[PDB]
Design a protein around this ligand. Sequence first.
Ligand SMILES: Nc1nc2c(ncn2[C@@H]2O[C@H](COP(=O)(O)OP(=O)(O)OP(=O)(O)O)[C@@H](O)[C@H]2O)c(=O)[nH]1
Ligand SMILES: Nc1nc2c(ncn2[C@@H]2O[C@H](COP(=O)(O)OP(=O)(O)O)[C@@H](O)[C@H]2O)c(=O)[nH]1
Ligand SMILES: Nc1nc2c(ncn2[C@@H]2O[C@H](COP(=O)(O)OP(=O)(O)O)[C@@H](O)[C@H]2O)c(=O)[nH]1
Ligand SMILES: [Mg+2]
Lengths: 442, 238, 430, 430, 26, 55, 50
Amino acid sequence: REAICIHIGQAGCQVGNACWELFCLEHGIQPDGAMPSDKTIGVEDDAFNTFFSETGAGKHVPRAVFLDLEPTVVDEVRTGTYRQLFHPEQLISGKEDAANNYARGHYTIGKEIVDLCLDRIRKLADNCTGLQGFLVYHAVGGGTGSGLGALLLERLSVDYGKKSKLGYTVYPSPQVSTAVVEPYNSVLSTHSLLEHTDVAAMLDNEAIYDLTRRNLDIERPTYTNLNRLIGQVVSSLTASLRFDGALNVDLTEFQTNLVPYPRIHFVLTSYAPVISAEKAYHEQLSVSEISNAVFEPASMMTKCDPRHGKYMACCLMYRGDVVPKDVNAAVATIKTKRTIQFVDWSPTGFKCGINYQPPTVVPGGDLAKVQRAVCMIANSTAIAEVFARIDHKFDLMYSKRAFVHWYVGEGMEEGEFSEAREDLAALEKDYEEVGAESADMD
Amino acid sequence: STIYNAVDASTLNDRCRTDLLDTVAQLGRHCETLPKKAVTTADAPLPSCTFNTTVSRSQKEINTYFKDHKPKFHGALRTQDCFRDTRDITQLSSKEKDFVHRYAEAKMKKSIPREESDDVAKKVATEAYTEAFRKFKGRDPTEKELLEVERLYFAYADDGAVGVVQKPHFHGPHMHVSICNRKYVTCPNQVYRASLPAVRNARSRFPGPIPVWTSTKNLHAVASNDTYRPGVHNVSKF
Amino acid sequence: REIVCVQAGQCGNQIGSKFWEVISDEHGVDPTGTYQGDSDLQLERINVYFDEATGGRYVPRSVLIDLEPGTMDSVRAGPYGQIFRPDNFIFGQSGAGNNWAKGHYTEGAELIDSVLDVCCKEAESCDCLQGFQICHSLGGGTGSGMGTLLISKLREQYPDRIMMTFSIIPSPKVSDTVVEPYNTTLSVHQLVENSDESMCIDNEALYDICFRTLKLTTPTFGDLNHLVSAVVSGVTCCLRFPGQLNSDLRKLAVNLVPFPRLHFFMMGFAPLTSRGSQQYRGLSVPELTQQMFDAKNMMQAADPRHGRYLTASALFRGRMSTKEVDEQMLNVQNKNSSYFIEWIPNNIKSSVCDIPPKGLKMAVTFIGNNTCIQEMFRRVGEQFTLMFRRKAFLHWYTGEGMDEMEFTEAESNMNDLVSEYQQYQDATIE
Amino acid sequence: REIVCVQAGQCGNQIGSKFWEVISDEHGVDPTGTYQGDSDLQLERINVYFDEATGGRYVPRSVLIDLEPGTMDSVRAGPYGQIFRPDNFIFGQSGAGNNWAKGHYTEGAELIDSVLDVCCKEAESCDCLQGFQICHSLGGGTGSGMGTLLISKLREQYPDRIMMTFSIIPSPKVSDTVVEPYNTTLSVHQLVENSDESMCIDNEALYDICFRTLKLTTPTFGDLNHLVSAVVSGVTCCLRFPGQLNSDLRKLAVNLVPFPRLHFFMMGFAPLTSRGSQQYRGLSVPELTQQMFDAKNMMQAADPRHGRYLTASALFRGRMSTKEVDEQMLNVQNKNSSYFIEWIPNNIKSSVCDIPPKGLKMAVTFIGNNTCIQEMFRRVGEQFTLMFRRKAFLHWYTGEGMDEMEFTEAESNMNDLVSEYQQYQDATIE
Amino acid sequence: TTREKKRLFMMQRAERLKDPKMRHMG
Amino acid sequence: KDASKRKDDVPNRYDKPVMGVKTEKNYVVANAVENVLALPTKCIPTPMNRAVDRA
Amino acid sequence: YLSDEPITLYTGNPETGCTMTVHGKTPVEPVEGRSRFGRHTYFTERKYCL
Ligand SMILES: Nc1nc2c(ncn2[C@@H]2O[C@H](COP(=O)(O)OP(=O)(O)OP(=O)(O)O)[C@@H](O)[C@H]2O)c(=O)[nH]1
Ligand SMILES: Nc1nc2c(ncn2[C@@H]2O[C@H](COP(=O)(O)OP(=O)(O)O)[C@@H](O)[C@H]2O)c(=O)[nH]1
Ligand SMILES: Nc1nc2c(ncn2[C@@H]2O[C@H](COP(=O)(O)OP(=O)(O)O)[C@@H](O)[C@H]2O)c(=O)[nH]1
Ligand SMILES: [Mg+2]
């Protein structure tokens, strides 16, 4: 009935600020952690409990840790507006960064910080009674996010065992780039994400920039817009735990319906009524129209085209004014289309959810206010195409050992490059093989 | 005070005293005969600092009988069967063996001959089935139609005829409902031997909302849902 | 002659809530539990579904079971929820996960002893116990696994009574969950061995009933569960009111089931008509007879025109002549001879009951045993074979612990049920 | 027919305080000692628990013993504490230290003569003396050592009376002290020789009663002591009020004990139900009998389902028909016949008393002699064997003066008790 | 008087612990 | 270095389980023969033996 | 626009009072500014009990 969020490095903390801003404003907790309640025992709710616990003085505090190796971003959180919301132990900061080296984070520096993080997570897990997973936010392009995220997921996987770990990951975009060494860190990261995650959602900033230019009317977007979109997606997926509805969906139902084989756990995400205020005047927003919207590749938050692959499973979350009969009519119309294709071994391709709470509006936000929305997470073979562009960049750099001396000097064997590159080749072949129609006797 | 002193100081006559003392002695002997658990003994290689002491601690110290009667009643109802005696519950049933053979045949994509057994029950059942088939249809049954013997449960009637139990009953206690309700430990519709099923302990969990159960290794250790479920494996006959 | 109800899973608990609303209305029981009826005929059989608690109150003989308490707080919050005994709500902590093996093996065995204890508590209080009635879906997780587990335990403990199930089966057209074929196949395997009589309902058929016949603008799951609660409360009406030709669940089973595996039935309820049309047609026995056999009014996707009737039963409620019932059933039997299996000389049983549901002049409920039910199971088997050949989601079930041989058992048992129906369809006198 | 009660140690003194509250309420005695009751039926047996001092007042025939006075100051501070005779409180100046040998041999022998002097003064004042009743814990220090010492001395001095004990023994799950197995083993060794009838209670079973049956939000030791005080005051009800079929402690012993070592019994009391639920189910003799045999309502961790009943007794309080009692007890004997030892043709005694406990129209208390008690002793013996093999804490006991041979004797005697129960627990087809 | 103070302390404790939230984290 | 293997490898497209198992039988004749051989049963109490018939 | 509650089928019409009765609802806190669709679990989970 609760979930714990782990935020790592710069992207993960900045996305955390938008997430906790939204969850506070949606539940109604004030910035100092107070919330009035009812004075008579028995007339009270619980929806906050998924994300907040209350102190004996009536302050609310959230089930999150913020992990960074550089101080600046956590000190920014400490001096901002939400200073009193977080417990100070939860905001953990080291002395110096991992300098874009996965090896520095994993072997040298994250090894010092990891035990404090594990002690905080243990202290959180002891104050729970129905924990049903971990949410992790990180980028695989930078050094501390890759190295410490991998090390921490390995340790969590040993200590907690069967408990689920769901990752939201900012992967390196296919032509927008921020640092030279991104391919090495992303390749080395993906091996750990392969072994130690139950579902992984992939994001690219280039897609969210395209989405904010095309659908919203923003000439000069910045990271706060992208982070607000991510926060809305996470709020949509966790709303099924927190509010009344016709068809609830527990986090184990996602894994049961979405994952066909235990390695085939990388999923695409999209969100439907991303629309400006001017458009709201001229657009109807029926169930079938937003369902048709979620299938356009212009709606996706990862730069991949699903027409180059086959769908295995789709999970559609409706929140707001929807009637099950309209969902059924929409899904039957989608099923009729010939540009939408499912693997022939998956005839019953869809999972539905219906929740009564409509999406919340944030004071500075850019999305319009709408009475209904739908959010989809889906598993498709097209993702194999996403890995190939990173692997080509790895081969280009590695042919001349362009930067390897940093990694070897900071403690890593050269062999780890070849192992990881072979593992990504095998993952690509797995997604090719699972997606092949039918079979033959010879 | 011992029993001997109380008996000797009582007001009973001599014969009653002798009878009471003999009863106590016989009970003691029968208790001695019983299976038991061996009395514990300290280990031999036990380390030091167990026989040692300390100055302060040293200053603190001050330094046959039960005859068996099984009455029999004339004309009592029959409560046993040969077919029931041959079968056992821990092994695979005949229908399960038939499915295993069919599964092997389907996997190997060819017919596999079945093993031949010299059990008299199988021969009796096959003879009865052939007679019934010949009465219903003029033909004799083929080899394919004789496979029906494995799928059915057979039993004797009271007069010696061979039949088939359509709807078997549970081998544990169950209900037959009529003008009055009754419990039958054994009934002729049962296929296997009568037995009392094991049950789970009612007080296995902690008295509270916390997830703590009793351990499966001993009677005092505790366990939780970490990497295994302790609540499903607490079933025991006694 | 007392019935014990079991309500399992979300669908079962919701249908049960509507059923106990309908029953409380028919006997004039206030939602506080106080009797407020207006004829002795209501009071004289109240024992059949209610037990009497002290100073006035009546309590309904039902057990509610679910794996997540979300539903239970919703039913307790409903308008009649207070009537239910608090000790009768049984719930777990973690969900079924839409997985049959989880629902059957891990949380099933954890809860099952407390449900059996409650069912025994309810059964042993009756002076004479009639059959059990169970509502659940076959496509779900706790519904399928714990429903079939409980059915097996009750069938072990009460083999001479009647076992009745109402069951929802996944549409081929509008599924809510991907792993429906596995749960359905394993549950039908359990039911065909355990049950005495089983009724099957497709949500697609209830939608087609609502849209075409009732012309509802915005139907909800409450309407579908109201139709089901109507038939459920109708089948027992002759048990609990006087009539010119009494009937009973055991008498229905004896007339409907020729051989013990052939116990799957179709359902219908006749007086359905939209508020605009109601001014145009008075109730009469010909109108009920024409609607009862109209495939528009039948609650399964399979249609009678592809099969043959082995047997059928009609229970009439209201003050009406027996001659019209007999002559209608004779005329339909003589005029329609191709739709009736020819080696049985008369396929229809009739029954007549004096007391209609409040505010209706007459009603009939129809139960039909037709071989076209084989088409639904074959269709489910097709979707299963598509998924199973590729091991599409099997690791979840195997991780719970199932051997793959269980899946082959369930396929073989369903295939044998389809074969037995097909063989009896094409049988001949010679 | 007068009973003398003895309460020893903190647990014993607390349970005694709650017992004397319940008894003073039933006979209408004000905390000043003045009679304020409202029927003559109360007066005619007041002698059973109270002695009369001059000018109206009554004082209760009880001895209070403890090794440190903290509890005595707490009971004197309690709501009924004033009623107790000042000369009846006997206490030392230093604690038992949770050590059996300390409680039994060194500080025990210093005080025991003054306790025996008070007990003899109280016994010789009765016109006819019925058995003694003793409350203590077996896991403690002064409770175990001085309770068993006093039991041995009183059994020497009054061998023709009855000796009855209620005793609490440490849970394997919810313990307060590390050296519990030694004290428990030595106390059970003393009891099986000394006692005539012994009742055993697990605090874990009372917690499960409170949490599952009573749904208490914040239970306290006062509630646990009320459940115990309820059963203890119920067993004596037929001694002190009229009824259709009188019963007595000696009559219970004669019907319950087949052989003199098999004298350890389970207890239950039937009408337990939470204030919210009570509106949904009226009390009746079938309901009380069904709860009465339900293991949920039994005050030990061992479950009856793993053993068989040799004998049982039910004492009914209230105005009721004898036919329902007789036919219900017959029905329970017939329905669960596998759990009853077959070489006794009828295992149950019934008794009926007109006057119920205050605020209930009717109640029943259950006493059961079941072989499943062997599981409790086996568990304690296991923990002892783990500790004893390694000499884990023995120097404390040896420094007080105990021979290790005492430990081996006590272990052997308990093992023989377990064997005797084990032979009768299992069937023997031969 | 000692008895009055002990009774008063026990009564106030019972008043405090009646609320489960205050018993848990007051 | 972590070298754990948590997830099993995906199956080949040619690897198929044993499936489509069907038993062959004439249900009409089998049901008739089973009905012929069936033994009668009763749910009424068995007649009780008198106390005099003891040996 | 940041504070008004959207008009739904499940909230009913505010200016006419009509409200359809559907499954899946729970008791409602009467405090100002709180959503009526927040989960209620007091009946099945007595919080802070022991
Ligand atoms: N969408 C989004 N992307 C971000 C954000 N912040 C950084 N990124 C992207 O993530 C990558 C950089 O990763 P960082 O988080 O800066 O790396 P790090 O965790 O700080 O690792 P170190 O540099 O060693 O401390 C680049 O591709 C950035 O574009 C953010 O707030 N939102
Ligand atoms: N007719 C009807 N169907 C329902 C209802 N609730 C759920 N369902 C259907 O049952 C299936 C979901 O099964 P569910 O009851 O949630 O399974 P569970 O999780 O094991 O309880 C879906 O096909 C739903 O459409 C209801 O109230 N009425
Ligand atoms: N039921 C109940 N148990 C008690 C009470 N007081 C102590 N206990 C239990 O008895 C054991 C302690 O034994 P104790 O009475 O202190 O032994 P003593 O020091 O010899 O009197 C522990 O398991 C306590 O939980 C009480 O008032 N009621
Ligand atoms: Mg950085």
